[PDB]
Amino acid sequence: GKKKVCYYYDGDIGNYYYGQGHPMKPHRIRMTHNLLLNYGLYRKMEIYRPHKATAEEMTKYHSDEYIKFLRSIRPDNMSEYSKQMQRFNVGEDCPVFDGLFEFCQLSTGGSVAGAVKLNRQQTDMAVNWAGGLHHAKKSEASGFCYVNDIVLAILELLKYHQRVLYIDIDIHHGDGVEEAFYTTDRVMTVSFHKYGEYFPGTGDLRDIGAGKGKYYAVNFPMRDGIDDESYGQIFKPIISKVMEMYQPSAVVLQCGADSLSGDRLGCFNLTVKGHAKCVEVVKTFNLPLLMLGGGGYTIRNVARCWTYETAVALDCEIPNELPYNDYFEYFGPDFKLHISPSNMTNQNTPEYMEKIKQRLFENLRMLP
Ligand SMILES: CCC(O)(O)CCCCC[C@H](NC(=O)C1CN(C)C1)c1[nH]c(-c2ccccc2)nc1C(N)=O
Ligand SMILES: [Ca+2]
Ligand SMILES: [Ca+2]
Ligand SMILES: [Zn+2]
């Protein structure tokens, strides 16, 4: 039935600024929080302010040198770190900004705190919209991500769970998470993403894991314009088969909103209902679940998406008419929660979707 939901948020998160022209806007997390507060969704959730994760907590995955660099670099001293900036991939996508380290600490803190709460069996679901930064690597920043809060949260879950399932619905391949666990069977990573002349360039159908991890990495490559009907028809069957064969005891779901119609960087055509159907599907399995953020670059739609997904987690129905809020004008000209898909062509034919699903089903038959 209805579950207990713990939500992690720091009121300072919206003030971190990647810089002029950078599409990643932490302010979208504050818009989400304010919208969900004005819908009354605070009355049913336990709200927590995450601790600032320590460099030590971060080094459970990342190298000591990379975390020391992140904790030391600032816009005023960048000139003295040109060598380490190249080595750790700090540049246009992952710039140095005021409070970069604290932003990483808050993003990571929410994910790890949520994982601890799930481990202690004190909540059914934990939500951290500031997390889900799936591209960060052991000693390298990538694609707007510096510290891989997801990998850290999964390592925390692995203390009490033999098998953890990771599902990623961001439009970009979940490469950092896939790479971290590529050679183990204790985590199964499942990513649905645009593949072909698109960042990060990984996530081929044929990337299925290695060694003990062979068959424990699943990739569903898609083309432009996927819609609710098409996504829905493959998501539930794949996740159901993964649940059946893998039998995970905890799940982490990355809810990157750049898979929505009208995203500034994305090329998919999902509505908020289509995206949220993934949360409904996963929630139905009644397993401890950590829901995380990720991409999303048309910020009014990211706030709508994550507000609706928080309502889905709470089994609370909320009206389509948006309540008045601090950012009301951002939701014009309609001031509604739900969005309409565009007229873009769906290049994922029904036959292509079935064929890729059948290839993934063949790989899933190889599990013990
Ligand atoms: C938070 C999780 C997430 O998966 O959503 C993150 C998505 C990251 C997208 C990164 C992308 N970067 C690249 O394509 C760079 C150029 N190539 C040599 C690598 C990129 N960087 C930028 C960019 C634009 C302006 C200023 C800075 C970066 N745009 C793009 C783009 N359109 O793909
Ligand atoms: Ca993905
Ligand atoms: Ca794996
Ligand atoms: Zn993305």
PDB file of all heavy atoms in Angstrom, residues 134 168-174 191-193, ligand 2:
ATOM      1  N   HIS A 134      25.349  10.898 -12.423  1.00  0.00           N
ATOM      2  CA  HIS A 134      25.832   9.616 -12.905  1.00  0.00           C
ATOM      3  C   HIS A 134      27.078   9.548 -13.755  1.00  0.00           C
ATOM      4  O   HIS A 134      27.557   8.414 -13.937  1.00  0.00           O
ATOM      5  CB  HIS A 134      24.685   8.899 -13.664  1.00  0.00           C
ATOM      6  CG  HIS A 134      24.120   9.611 -14.867  1.00  0.00           C
ATOM      7  ND1 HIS A 134      23.150   9.002 -15.649  1.00  0.00           N
ATOM      8  CD2 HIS A 134      24.390  10.835 -15.387  1.00  0.00           C
ATOM      9  CE1 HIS A 134      22.865   9.861 -16.620  1.00  0.00           C
ATOM     10  NE2 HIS A 134      23.601  10.973 -16.517  1.00  0.00           N
ATOM     11  N   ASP A 168      18.308   3.768 -14.734  1.00  0.00           N
ATOM     12  CA  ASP A 168      18.598   5.148 -15.095  1.00  0.00           C
ATOM     13  C   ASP A 168      17.776   5.573 -16.305  1.00  0.00           C
ATOM     14  O   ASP A 168      17.985   5.035 -17.410  1.00  0.00           O
ATOM     15  CB  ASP A 168      20.117   5.193 -15.371  1.00  0.00           C
ATOM     16  CG  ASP A 168      20.742   6.535 -15.639  1.00  0.00           C
ATOM     17  OD1 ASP A 168      20.087   7.372 -16.281  1.00  0.00           O
ATOM     18  OD2 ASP A 168      21.915   6.731 -15.239  1.00  0.00           O
ATOM     19  N   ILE A 169      16.844   6.527 -16.115  1.00  0.00           N
ATOM     20  CA  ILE A 169      15.962   7.022 -17.167  1.00  0.00           C
ATOM     21  C   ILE A 169      16.340   8.429 -17.665  1.00  0.00           C
ATOM     22  O   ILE A 169      15.616   9.035 -18.468  1.00  0.00           O
ATOM     23  CB  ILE A 169      14.460   6.910 -16.811  1.00  0.00           C
ATOM     24  CG1 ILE A 169      14.105   7.807 -15.612  1.00  0.00           C
ATOM     25  CG2 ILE A 169      14.097   5.437 -16.538  1.00  0.00           C
ATOM     26  CD1 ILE A 169      12.594   7.856 -15.412  1.00  0.00           C
ATOM     27  N   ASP A 170      17.529   8.936 -17.281  1.00  0.00           N
ATOM     28  CA  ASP A 170      18.092  10.173 -17.843  1.00  0.00           C
ATOM     29  C   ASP A 170      18.288   9.892 -19.367  1.00  0.00           C
ATOM     30  O   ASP A 170      18.424   8.706 -19.759  1.00  0.00           O
ATOM     31  CB  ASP A 170      19.474  10.351 -17.220  1.00  0.00           C
ATOM     32  CG  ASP A 170      20.103  11.699 -17.450  1.00  0.00           C
ATOM     33  OD1 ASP A 170      20.661  11.910 -18.542  1.00  0.00           O
ATOM     34  OD2 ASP A 170      20.040  12.534 -16.532  1.00  0.00           O
ATOM     35  N   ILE A 171      18.231  10.933 -20.214  1.00  0.00           N
ATOM     36  CA  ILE A 171      18.428  10.660 -21.648  1.00  0.00           C
ATOM     37  C   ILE A 171      19.862  10.209 -21.947  1.00  0.00           C
ATOM     38  O   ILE A 171      20.095   9.556 -22.985  1.00  0.00           O
ATOM     39  CB  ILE A 171      18.012  11.875 -22.499  1.00  0.00           C
ATOM     40  CG1 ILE A 171      17.807  11.441 -23.950  1.00  0.00           C
ATOM     41  CG2 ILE A 171      19.012  13.005 -22.370  1.00  0.00           C
ATOM     42  CD1 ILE A 171      17.268  12.575 -24.842  1.00  0.00           C
ATOM     43  N   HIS A 172      20.845  10.531 -21.084  1.00  0.00           N
ATOM     44  CA  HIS A 172      22.227  10.166 -21.317  1.00  0.00           C
ATOM     45  C   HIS A 172      22.572   8.871 -20.626  1.00  0.00           C
ATOM     46  O   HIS A 172      22.062   8.566 -19.542  1.00  0.00           O
ATOM     47  CB  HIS A 172      23.198  11.290 -20.829  1.00  0.00           C
ATOM     48  CG  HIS A 172      22.893  12.623 -21.450  1.00  0.00           C
ATOM     49  ND1 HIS A 172      22.057  13.520 -20.830  1.00  0.00           N
ATOM     50  CD2 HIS A 172      23.293  13.142 -22.640  1.00  0.00           C
ATOM     51  CE1 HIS A 172      21.961  14.566 -21.637  1.00  0.00           C
ATOM     52  NE2 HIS A 172      22.677  14.382 -22.758  1.00  0.00           N
ATOM     53  N   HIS A 173      23.460   8.089 -21.250  1.00  0.00           N
ATOM     54  CA  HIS A 173      23.909   6.831 -20.668  1.00  0.00           C
ATOM     55  C   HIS A 173      24.511   7.020 -19.263  1.00  0.00           C
ATOM     56  O   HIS A 173      25.284   7.953 -19.074  1.00  0.00           O
ATOM     57  CB  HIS A 173      24.980   6.209 -21.588  1.00  0.00           C
ATOM     58  CG  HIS A 173      25.539   4.923 -21.056  1.00  0.00           C
ATOM     59  ND1 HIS A 173      26.902   4.722 -20.965  1.00  0.00           N
ATOM     60  CD2 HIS A 173      24.893   3.822 -20.598  1.00  0.00           C
ATOM     61  CE1 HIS A 173      27.048   3.505 -20.463  1.00  0.00           C
ATOM     62  NE2 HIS A 173      25.867   2.927 -20.225  1.00  0.00           N
ATOM     63  N   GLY A 174      24.132   6.152 -18.317  1.00  0.00           N
ATOM     64  CA  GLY A 174      24.658   6.178 -16.946  1.00  0.00           C
ATOM     65  C   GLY A 174      26.039   5.538 -16.886  1.00  0.00           C
ATOM     66  O   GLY A 174      26.240   4.518 -16.218  1.00  0.00           O
ATOM     67  N   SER A 191      20.277   0.973 -18.081  1.00  0.00           N
ATOM     68  CA  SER A 191      20.175   2.336 -18.586  1.00  0.00           C
ATOM     69  C   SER A 191      19.400   2.394 -19.880  1.00  0.00           C
ATOM     70  O   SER A 191      19.691   1.616 -20.786  1.00  0.00           O
ATOM     71  CB  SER A 191      21.584   2.892 -18.812  1.00  0.00           C
ATOM     72  OG  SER A 191      21.599   4.196 -19.378  1.00  0.00           O
ATOM     73  N   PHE A 192      18.456   3.323 -19.980  1.00  0.00           N
ATOM     74  CA  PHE A 192      17.647   3.584 -21.173  1.00  0.00           C
ATOM     75  C   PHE A 192      18.119   4.954 -21.601  1.00  0.00           C
ATOM     76  O   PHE A 192      18.005   5.917 -20.817  1.00  0.00           O
ATOM     77  CB  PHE A 192      16.158   3.630 -20.840  1.00  0.00           C
ATOM     78  CG  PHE A 192      15.659   2.352 -20.202  1.00  0.00           C
ATOM     79  CD1 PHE A 192      15.757   2.156 -18.839  1.00  0.00           C
ATOM     80  CD2 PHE A 192      15.095   1.349 -20.974  1.00  0.00           C
ATOM     81  CE1 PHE A 192      15.298   0.987 -18.255  1.00  0.00           C
ATOM     82  CE2 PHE A 192      14.654   0.162 -20.389  1.00  0.00           C
ATOM     83  CZ  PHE A 192      14.738  -0.001 -19.031  1.00  0.00           C
ATOM     84  N   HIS A 193      18.655   5.066 -22.831  1.00  0.00           N
ATOM     85  CA  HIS A 193      19.216   6.353 -23.224  1.00  0.00           C
ATOM     86  C   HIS A 193      19.302   6.548 -24.718  1.00  0.00           C
ATOM     87  O   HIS A 193      19.281   5.579 -25.476  1.00  0.00           O
ATOM     88  CB  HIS A 193      20.653   6.439 -22.660  1.00  0.00           C
ATOM     89  CG  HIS A 193      21.472   5.218 -22.965  1.00  0.00           C
ATOM     90  ND1 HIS A 193      21.588   4.191 -22.053  1.00  0.00           N
ATOM     91  CD2 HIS A 193      22.124   4.873 -24.101  1.00  0.00           C
ATOM     92  CE1 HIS A 193      22.319   3.254 -22.649  1.00  0.00           C
ATOM     93  NE2 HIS A 193      22.660   3.619 -23.889  1.00  0.00           N
TER      94      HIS A 193
HETATM   95 CA    CA B   2      20.015   6.597 -18.918  1.00  0.00          CA
END
